[PDB]
Amino acid sequence: HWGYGKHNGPEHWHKDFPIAKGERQSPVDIDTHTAKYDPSLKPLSVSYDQATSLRILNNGHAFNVEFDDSQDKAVLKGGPLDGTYRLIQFHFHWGSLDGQGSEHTVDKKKYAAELHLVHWNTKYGDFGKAVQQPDGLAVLGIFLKVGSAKPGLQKVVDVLDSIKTKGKSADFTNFDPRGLLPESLDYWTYPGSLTTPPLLECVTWIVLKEPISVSSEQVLKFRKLNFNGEGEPEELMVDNWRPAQPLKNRQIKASFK
Ligand SMILES: NS(=O)(=O)c1ccc(NC(=O)C[C@]23C[C@H]4C[C@H](C[C@H](C4)C2)C3)cc1
Numbered sequence: 001h002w003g004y005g006k007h008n009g010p011e012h013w014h015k016d017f018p019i020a021k022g023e024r025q026s027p028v029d030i031d032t033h034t035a036k037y038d039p040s041l042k043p044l045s046v047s048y049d050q051a052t053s054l055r056i057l058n059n060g061h062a063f064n065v066e067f068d069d070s071q072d073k074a075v076l077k078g079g080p081l082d083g084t085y086r087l088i089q090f091h092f093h094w095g096s097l098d099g100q101g102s103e104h105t106v107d108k109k110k111y112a113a114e115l116h117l118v119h120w121n122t123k124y125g126d127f128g129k130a131v132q133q134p135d136g137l138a139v140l141g142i143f144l145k146v147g148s149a150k151p152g153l154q155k156v157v158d159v160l161d162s163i164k165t166k167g168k169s170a171d172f173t174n175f176d177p178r179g180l181l182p183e184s185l186d187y188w189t190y191p192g193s194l195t196t197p198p199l200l201e202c203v204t205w206i207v208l209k210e211p212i213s214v215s216s217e218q219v220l221k222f223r224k225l226n227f228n229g230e231g232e233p234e235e236l237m238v239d240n241w242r243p244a245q246p247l248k249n250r251q252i253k254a255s256f257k
């Protein structure tokens, strides 16, 4: 099956998932000088005060913090979006070294990691339906650089010992995802895709301009996770990122100048 190794990594994905070579694939490089300021872009509306986290899961590719998305509890609105998008999960992609790990790049610059807060358009009823629509998902992407610790990340870091291997999950209630946001909500936006198989072209990407900082110890703990299941040979979960894909017939818009 697919993964991030030499023999099953991003260069191989197109054989099982031909959409890998499609017209709106993610991630992309964000060329800041070519991005277009769009003065009609609305401020983002992040409403996470009623967020209900449930569980954290190692799925063999990353770890997901899952939320109750059966009511409008944590929602994203505004920006380039019309309608209401419910938070279903967040996860990260990260590197084996501080100089790589993000999926999006900014003027070819790679960050140490990238956080994805995944939301789906409530007009489609459930997540499985939403991924089949060109405006089905909105993913809020946030870059991580190594520097000071991010206090709101620590509870996530603390529980990783409990989900070291593929298929492990742990209860993860009462987590506040607002503690993962930077100060500014200035963003770039473009139409794209899931960045792992099935690579469906269903995502409005909203990538924040301001990275958050996390400590060396925090990212080091990400790198102690395993891609493998318990009792299988140990493969460190690092470099679980897809490289930038061609922009093709797309323009990246900026909410700021
Ligand atoms: N990195 S990213 O934010 O772009 C991202 C987000 C999410 C996924 N995958 C999933 O949620 C799993 C899932 C498996 C099948 C097929 C679809 C729909 C349903 C049933 C859920 C996808 C992959 C990448």
Ligand SMILES: [Zn+2]
Pocket (backbone or CB within 6 Å): 091, 092, 093, 116, 195
């Ligand atoms: Zn992701």
